[PDB]
């Protein structure tokens, strides 16, 4: 009985850890998308056609 109740808590704690790892990954999804945009801008800015203004 003690092991069954403890195992029920264990699934709850495993799920909570899945929740935190899931949320952290979701935020890093947009960090990747932002960095990719910064990389496209950098490549566009490396061209010699641009003057200082652009």
């Amino acid at each position: 009985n003690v092991q069954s109740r403890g195992l029920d808590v264990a699934v709850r704690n495993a799920n909570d850890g899945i929740s935190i790892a899931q949320t952290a990954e979701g935020a890093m999804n947009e960090t990747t998308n932002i960095l990719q945009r910064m990389r496209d801008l950098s490549l566009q800015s490396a061209n010699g056609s641009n003057s200082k203004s652009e």
Partner: protein, 54 residues
């Protein structure tokens, strides 16, 4: 000979006007201030080609 020289000087001033005014969005090209500019053609950095305008 002086009459021909008049059109020679008008045309010579025409060449200097072309050199000093030709531009790509205000970026003068033919007056020698363009010098060498590298154009980035590639998905990764470091792949650029040097265009020289004289």
């Amino acid at each position: 000979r002086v009459a021909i020289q008049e059109e020679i000087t008008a045309l010579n001033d025409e060449l200097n006007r072309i050199a000093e005014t030709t531009s790509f969005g205000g970026n003068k090209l033919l007056n020698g201030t363009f010098s060498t500019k590298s154009f980035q053609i590639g998905a990764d950095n470091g792949e650029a080609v040097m265009l020289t305008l004289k």
